[PDB]
Amino acid sequence: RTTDPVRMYMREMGTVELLTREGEIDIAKRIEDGINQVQCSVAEYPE
Amino acid sequence: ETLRVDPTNDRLSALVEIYRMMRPGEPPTREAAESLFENLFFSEDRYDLS
Amino acid sequence: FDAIKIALASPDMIRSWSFGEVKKPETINYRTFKPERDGLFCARIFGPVKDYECLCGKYKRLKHRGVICEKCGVEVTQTKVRRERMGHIELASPTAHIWFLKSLPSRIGLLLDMPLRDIERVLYFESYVVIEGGMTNLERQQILTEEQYLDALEEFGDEFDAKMGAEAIQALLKSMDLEQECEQLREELNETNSETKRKKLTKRIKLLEAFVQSGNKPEWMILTVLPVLPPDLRPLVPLDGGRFATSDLNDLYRRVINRNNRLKRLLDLAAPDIIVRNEKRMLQEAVDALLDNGRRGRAITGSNKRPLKSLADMIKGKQGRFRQNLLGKRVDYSGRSVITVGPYLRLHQCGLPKKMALELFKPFIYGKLELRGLATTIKAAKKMVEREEAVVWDILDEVIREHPVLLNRAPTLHRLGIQAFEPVLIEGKAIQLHPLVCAAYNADFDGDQMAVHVPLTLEAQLEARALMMSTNNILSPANGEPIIVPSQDVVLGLYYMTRDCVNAKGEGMVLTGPKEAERLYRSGLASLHARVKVRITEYEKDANGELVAKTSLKDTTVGRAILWMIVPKGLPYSIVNQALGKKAISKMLNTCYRILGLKPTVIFADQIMYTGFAYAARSGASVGIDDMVIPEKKHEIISEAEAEVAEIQEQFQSGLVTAGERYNKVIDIWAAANDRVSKAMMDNLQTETVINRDGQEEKQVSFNSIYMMADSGARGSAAQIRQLAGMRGLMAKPDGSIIETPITANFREGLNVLQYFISTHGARKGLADTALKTANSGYLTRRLVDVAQDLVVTEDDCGTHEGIMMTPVIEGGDVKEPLRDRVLGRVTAEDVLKPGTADILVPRNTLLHEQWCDLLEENSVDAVKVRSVVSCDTDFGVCAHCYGRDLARGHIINKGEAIGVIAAQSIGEPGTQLTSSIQVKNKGSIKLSNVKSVVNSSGKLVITSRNTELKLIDEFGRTKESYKVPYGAVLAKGDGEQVAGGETVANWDPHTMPVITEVSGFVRFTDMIDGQTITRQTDELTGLSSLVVLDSAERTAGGKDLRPALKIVDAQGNDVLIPGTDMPAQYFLPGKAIVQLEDGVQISSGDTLARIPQGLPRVADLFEARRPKEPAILAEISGIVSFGKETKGKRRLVITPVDGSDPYEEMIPKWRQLNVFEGERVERGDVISDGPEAPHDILRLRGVHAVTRYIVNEVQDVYRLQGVKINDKHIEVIVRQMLRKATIVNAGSSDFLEGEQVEYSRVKIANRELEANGKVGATYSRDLLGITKASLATESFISAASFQETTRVLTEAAVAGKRDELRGLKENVIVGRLIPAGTGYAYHQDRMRRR
RNA sequence: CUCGA
Ligand SMILES: [Mg+2]
Ligand SMILES: [Zn+2]
Ligand SMILES: [Zn+2]
């Protein structure tokens, strides 16, 4: 019912929630455990 | 006759209608619905008959 | 080339136009001013910068004609090719074209059969759409929401495929089949039976057929490759001060390239979906901000806080390429100066300054200076003009002579607004014009300016001598009256020269000729006014070609003798023997032109101007303050009106009269008081008592200096002398109400303070009306030219045997348009004969001109059938004989003249000038038509029908009066009786509409129940009441189904007959059916049963054919009428024919007036309600000859009342141009209910159903279209795209594959070609034939 | 925008 794109963008970003202090530590631990599987699984290759 | 075609019932359900008339396409909260009707008419900078 | 084609553009076509993909948003460099690599200005893609140079400068000098440098890639060619090379941008996502999306209708939901409100939820990334569903729980194009897609993904897995964005609509258009839906809709179109859907399914079927006929594919609606304009049509030029100055397409293009590169970068970073869904939305917004700016959402603003002009804002409006740079250009060899009057000229000459003709004719001067060897080259011939030497001004007199030059004055309203004169050379700085052509130009010498255009070639120089010279335009194309009628000063001189005093210094003497009357006037022995006896010799040429002299002593003045040395040979002396006002001079010039030719008329009109200026200078006609004479009985009339207003005032101060009576009494006693002074001043002005030859007191018409300007028609009327001696009449405040007290003071005695402030409402109203009238009167002319642009005389004769029938207008009182000038000029259709019904006096097709039309005027003929433009049978133009007479020249029109531009200019030019009892007037016979009538009880006649009109015939046959008479009037006379002027022949009530019974027998009040079906009302004063019924809404709502039918029967009860037929007679009951005469009464015929009671935007409303708000409805077919279903606001009525198809019904709201009742009979095309009628229903029910006769009797009552003469032939041209698109109702050749041309649906029957097969049938029905719509539905789309709605016309003609043909003469003006009319029309046949 | 026809 609108045509201003900034209202569409802010309405789309409005659905998600802000993060607390420990939430960023949780997501950083997720990223490190995502890359650590690639690190410890490349050790069985000749490359 | 106006009080029957009126779809609202309460205060917090009537500011939402003014918000959806003036700012369509944005989902309203109460804290931003009160401030629109306050700063529309009853603010010392946004309204002036002078 | 000979045809322009237009269609959609495939991406292969855009790659075939392109010269290289643009990749970077850079325009130029900042230190040096060079275009950058792969920019918007790049030298590799669009060509080099300078002539025959690359960028690096490795190649120059024209030796390398077409090499490509290996360093910079620039192809060495001219810099001219920067205006013709295009580039393209490879979009990283498909995006929708805004023209095929958000025009109205949608054109992309018209194909998909989906609303625009549903498509825009998919183009914006808001809701998914299902392309295909393997399990049919999800249908095609069923829009899912954001969260519903998560349920549908888990309930099915990957059996369905849903997408979101412009690629969803692209895969939706790509995965459709036209050949399934075409046959499906073509089989369900002739299965269903409705009207509301068959006006849409036909359009969808025609769109699907036009897609496969043009060869397009529906995937090209969605852009994938966007083309770039060449970089010399959107330039970037450095100004003088070092600041650059760009066009604004280098901002929108730079936005598209920037956001496209950012989308290419975001798709390789593996970004989340909230970023990519926003980036694709921004790319689509930046694309349609370039194609058409203010359509999607908010308009894109630059840095100036102004909306940037997009690509669609460059071809539309009054600033596009169409309306400002293609139809009208700025031309070379042109000039501009202030005009001034000079009377020493002839009719074909004009002045010209020396310093203007030295600049216009400069290359002619160079070509003449080089030929005589006076300068060896052009660079040494320019110095001889820069010094203004001796030999230049003697070469200019050879260059200028026999070389015409045009003279245009803006605004160029009509055809005479541009004329070609033969120049002379005067010193000064002002174009000297001839004083007689100022009536054509409408040029007052008060600071006007005129433009000077030179023709260059040898063909155009011959089109200014034989086509546009001012001695050829002495007749207006609007009407046969002259346009070189003399103006104010010369007509005052001719009025003063032809008068007579009483004593006059030597009257009664006898003279030999006119040449001894100038010798008497010049020596002073006899005055200019006298009464003498001269001996003249006039020539009458009624001998065929030969001139017979005859001599007689005439009793005349001296001035009428001294004028007669000017008049040519063939004219008689009765043309100068009168007082010679303004109408008599134009009548004399018209008589000379009709009798003698063109070559004496120019010399006569020049000598009249040379004489009227001379004998007005010798007189001296000065306005003094002693000339405005107050009537001496003026204060008495004003004192008497001031007495009579006080009686009404004191009657209002007590209670005797109301306010609305006093307000009209004051106006009615001031109007007669104003006219009693306006009579007195005029009766004092026009009479002067001079001494006779004896001592007597004889009166003559006066020699007052301000009456002679009013009587001679030079300046002013009698309405403006009243504001100089009598009182100002009654001013009106701008509410519209008239102020009570008037301005009792005039302009000689001087106004008051309040009377001058009251006098400013009218002047400001009339001055602010002209500033808003001319906009509509100059917009109507533009709407009129662009409809009738392409109507040129093509054939010479077609045998059509039909045409409309002429009749003088006879409304109300006297005739307003006689037959002598209404039928003049047109050929006849059928061989009309004498009132003794044999002895054919004029043949079938002869040109009715003078010496033919007064022969009709001698006899008593009244209705001649003439050929007309609305019934010609040729294609793409009308006959020469079906048109009539060329009103400018005076002969039959020639094959090649564009009619419709002359007709449109002739209608649209004077639009800025525009803003009971029956009492006969004379003695004659009485005729009636379509009349059923019975005698009354007393011995007179009553009338029981609707179509009857009382037509007074004279003693010879022509209808002098035509009077309407309604149903149920009681006449005083019978049919065909001798009458007396002033007598009353009809007596009928104005307010009520009675329902008088025709039957001579008893009555009985049958079938009425008081309380449930009818009501009761007793006459509270007299008592002679009866059983009445209430109105529609006020009555009981319990008995609206039980119809109260007062069935009149005798004392027995037997059904009495209608007179002449077996069926019984009843008298039914509508609302307000108050009957008077009691039950069981005996009546005769003529006995009442009941008496039921009751400017220029008009022209722009007629030609637009707008249906009015309250339309007078008409009955569709013949038959008897009864009301059917009941009032749900609108109760039906059926039209059941006696001999036809019963079940046709209708739907009447608003039960004010029903001219038919529920037992009466009607016809096709009559009145059911009353009021104005819509012009569509006149075409649908009555013939075409009743629409083209309704308009030329309705728009000719706007121009006639204002006093503007326009010949009726100029209106039938655009009425022919209106009813041009015709819809078919049967089939057999093309389709079912599509709207084709009437010219293509006539060529088919001229081919198909003659020798190919039998009558396969292409029966159509004509359709009427307004002038804003009959030009947006032509064949050639270039003639529509320059008029109005360029976006809709170009979009509608691009998905259909429309092919232009360049038929008319507005597309040949755009492409720079010879128009197919006039001198180009002879050449155009040698192109059309050899092809 | 102000002015002229
Ligand atoms: Mg002027
Ligand atoms: Zn190079
Ligand atoms: Zn014809």
From Swiss-Prot, chain A:
What subcellular compartments does it reside in? Answer: Cytoplasm
Instruction: Identify the domain of life.
Output: Bacteria
Tell me which family the UniProt entry assigns to this protein. Belongs to the sigma-70 factor family. RpoD/SigA subfamily.
Q: What does this protein do?
A: Sigma factors are initiation factors that promote the attachment of RNA polymerase to specific initiation sites and are then released. This sigma factor is the primary sigma factor during exponential growth. Preferentially transcribes genes associated with fast growth, such as ribosomal operons, other protein-synthesis related genes, rRNA- and tRNA-encoding genes and prfB.
Domain remark in the UniProt entry: Contains 4 domains, connected by flexible linkers. In the active conformation, the domains are in an extended conformation, each making extensive interactions with the RNA polymerase catalytic core. In the autoinhibited state, sigma-70 factor domain-1 packs closely together with sigma-70 factor domains-2 and -4, contrary to the extended conformation that is seen when the protein is part of the RNA polymerase holoenzyme.
Could you give the subunit structure recorded for this chain? Interacts transiently with the RNA polymerase catalytic core formed by RpoA, RpoB, RpoC and RpoZ (2 alpha, 1 beta, 1 beta' and 1 omega subunit) to form the RNA polymerase holoenzyme that can initiate transcription. Identified in a complex containing RpoD, the RNA polymerase subunits RpoA, RpoB and RpoZ, CRP and DNA. Interacts with Rsd; this prevents interaction with the RNA polymerase catalytic core and with promoter DNA, and as a consequence, promotes transcription from promoters that require alternative sigma factors. (Microbial infection) Interacts with Escherichia phage lambda antitermination protein Q.
The protein's name in its UniProt record:
RNA polymerase sigma factor RpoD
Q: Write down the species.
A: Escherichia coli (strain K12)
* Range of the intact protein held here: 93 to 139 of 613
Curated annotation (Swiss-Prot), chain B:
Question: What modifications follow translation?
Answer: Acetylated on several lysine residues in the presence of glucose.
| Quaternary structure and interacting proteins, as annotated | The RNAP catalytic core consists of 2 alpha, 1 beta, 1 beta' and 1 omega subunit. When a sigma factor is associated with the core the holoenzyme is formed, which can initiate transcription. The rRNA transcription and antitermination complex (rrnTAC) consists of RNAP, NusA, NusB, NusE (rpsJ), NusG, SubB, ribosomal protein S4, DNA and precursor rRNA; S4 is more flexible than other subunits. In pull-down experiments interacts with CedA. (Microbial infection) Interacts (via flap domain) with Escherichia phage lambda antitermination protein Q; this interaction renders bacterial RNAP resistant to transcription pausing and allows it to read through termination signals.
Q: How is it used?
A: Co-administration of salinamide and rifampicin or salinamide and myxopyronin suppresses the emergence of resistance to both antibiotics.
Could you read off the lineage of the organism from its UniProt record? Bacteria, Pseudomonadati, Pseudomonadota, Gammaproteobacteria, Enterobacterales
Q: What's the protein called, per UniProt?
A: DNA-directed RNA polymerase subunit beta
Please tell me where this chain falls within the complete protein, as first and last residue plus total length. 349 to 398 of 1342
Q: Which residues form a coiled coil?
A: none
Domain of life the protein comes from? Bacteria
> Per its database record, what is this protein's job?
DNA-dependent RNA polymerase (RNAP) catalyzes the transcription of DNA into RNA using the four ribonucleoside triphosphates as substrates.
Q: Which family does it belong to?
A: Belongs to the RNA polymerase beta chain family.
Q: Which organism encodes this protein?
A: Escherichia coli (strain K12)
Swiss-Prot record, chain C:
Which residues take part in binding Mg(2+)?
A: D444, D446, D448
Cofactor(s), by name: Mg(2+); Zn(2+)
**Residues that hold Zn(2+) 2 according to the record:** C798, C872, C879, C882
Q: Which InterPro entries match?
A: DNA-dir_RpoC_beta_prime (IPR045867), DNA-dir_RpoC_beta_prime_bact (IPR012754), RNA_pol_asu (IPR000722), RNA_pol_N (IPR006592), RNA_pol_Rpb1_1 (IPR007080), RNA_pol_Rpb1_3 (IPR007066), RNA_pol_Rpb1_3_sf (IPR042102), RNA_pol_Rpb1_4 (IPR007083)
Which reactions is this enzyme annotated as catalysing? Answer: RNA(n) + a ribonucleoside 5'-triphosphate = RNA(n+1) + diphosphate
Q: Name one GO biological process term.
A: cell motility
Q: What is its EC number?
A: 2.7.7.6
Indicate the impact reported for Q488P.
Resistant to antibiotics salinamide A and B
Q: Which Pfam families match?
A: RNA_pol_Rpb1_1 (PF04997), RNA_pol_Rpb1_2 (PF00623), RNA_pol_Rpb1_3 (PF04983), RNA_pol_Rpb1_4 (PF05000), RNA_pol_Rpb1_5 (PF04998)
Modification type N6-acetyllysine: residues: K951
**UniProt remark on cofactor binding:** Binds 1 Mg(2+) ion per subunit. Binds 2 Zn(2+) ions per subunit.
GO terms for MF: DNA binding; DNA-directed RNA polymerase activity; magnesium ion binding; zinc ion binding
Record-listed Zn(2+) 1 binding positions: C54, C56, C69, C72
Q: Name one GO cellular component term.
A: transcription elongation factor complex
| Assembly notes | The RNAP catalytic core consists of 2 alpha, 1 beta, 1 beta' and 1 omega subunit. When a sigma factor is associated with the core the holoenzyme is formed, which can initiate transcription. The rRNA transcription and antitermination complex (rrnTAC) consists of RNAP, NusA, NusB, NusE (rpsJ), NusG, SubB, ribosomal protein S4, DNA and precursor rRNA; S4 is more flexible than other subunits.
The entry sums up its family as follows:
Belongs to the RNA polymerase beta' chain family.
* HAMAP family reported for this sequence: RNApol_bact_RpoC
Q: Which NCBIfam families match?
A: rpoC_TIGR
The job of this chain, per UniProt, is described as: DNA-dependent RNA polymerase (RNAP) catalyzes the transcription of DNA into RNA using the four ribonucleoside triphosphates as substrates. Resistance to the antibiotics salinamide A, salinamide B, rifampicin, streptolydigin, CBR703, myxopyronin, and lipiarmycin can result from mutations in this protein.
**PANTHER family reported for this sequence:** DNA-DIRECTED RNA POLYMERASE, DNA-DIRECTED RNA POLYMERASE SUBUNIT BETA
Listed name of the protein: DNA-directed RNA polymerase subunit beta'
